[PDB]
Ligand SMILES: OC[C@@]1(O)OC[C@@H](O)[C@@H](O)[C@@H]1O
Ligand SMILES: OC[C@@]1(O)OC[C@@H](O)[C@@H](O)[C@@H]1O
Ligand SMILES: OC[C@@]1(O)OC[C@@H](O)[C@@H](O)[C@@H]1O
């Protein structure tokens with residue numbers, strides 16, 4: 186089936202749910218006023234996520250896997266880019 | 274194999290582990306004095322979870338997926354019910 | 362594909378990413394100065410993780426599943442050992 190990963194922050198809260206569906210990962214977002222589709226859209230069959238809130242900044246790391254390749258995607262306030270993570 | 278998701282809160286801590294096994298999701302709970310089976314029991318092939326502790330209240334969101342359908346289940350102090358989450 | 366689980370703590374942050382790949386779970390670690398391979402290496406087809414930071418101590422629980430058997434692995438400052446978790 187589709188596979189999901191979820192994270193949340195604050196007291197509202199903000200929630201992000203990532204779904205790997207048919208080789209594509211998309212993102213659904215809740216910030217207290219309805220669910221909406223987020224900017225994250227990248228290939229993957231499996232997804233995990235962690236996040237940490239520091240001051241006014243949310244930092245999100247999404248680990249997207251296809252086959253034996255895992256790509257880390259980073260949100261640090263200014264869009265998603267690939268991070269330095271490697272599997273070995 | 275079976276697939277799990279885990280969350281924890283406080284300093285004891287309380288831990289919740291959700292297992293998707295043969296199309297059913299069940300819940301195991303630790304609050305510092307032994308593991309026990311929790312109230313959550315719903316269909317699903319895949320599970321993720323996030324939680325946030327505010328004051329004296331734990332809020333838990335469990336994302337249960339079967340095929341391409343994901344159902345959000347909500348704990349806000351008074352049993353589990355379906356939440357407003359949709360995949361699109 | 363390979364399946365991952367991730368957790369993080371503090372403001373650096375420290376990040377741990379567990380990958381179930383071909384029946385084996387390994388661990389990649391970030392503490393602010395490069396990714397490296399951690400001590401955790403145990404069998405499993407699926408992995409989840411949760412952690413909680415108390416004072417100067419990180420506590421990590423990794424749930425490793427093979428077939429219908431899930432083993433909890435515990436980090437409490439002194440290496441990884443099996444925990445009391447059972448699926449029922
Ligand atoms: O629109 C909300 C948003 O900016 O929040 C932070 C990240 O989750 C982004 O992908 C997302 O688009
Ligand atoms: O700022 C991005 C970055 O340094 O954040 C910490 C880790 O997620 C790294 O892999 C990543 O490149
Ligand atoms: O009994 C403990 C319990 O109430 O804790 C909160 C939720 O995890 C419930 O499913 C669970 O039954």
Ligand SMILES: OC[C@@]1(O)OC[C@@H](O)[C@@H](O)[C@@H]1O
Pocket residue numbers: 215334345347349355356357358
């Ligand atoms: O109180 C329940 C609720 O509003 O909590 C926030 C989100 O999880 C929503 O999907 C959900 O319906």
Ligand SMILES: OC[C@@]1(O)OC[C@@H](O)[C@@H](O)[C@@H]1O
Pocket residue numbers: 377388390398399400401436
């Ligand atoms: O070397 C860093 C380390 O000790 O951090 C705590 C755990 O993640 C361990 O598996 C890991 O080896």
Ligand SMILES: OC[C@@]1(O)OC[C@@H](O)[C@@H](O)[C@@H]1O
Pocket residue numbers: 303422433435437443444445446
């Ligand atoms: O100190 C280890 C332990 O007691 O921690 C809490 C739970 O993870 C238990 O299953 C585990 O045996």
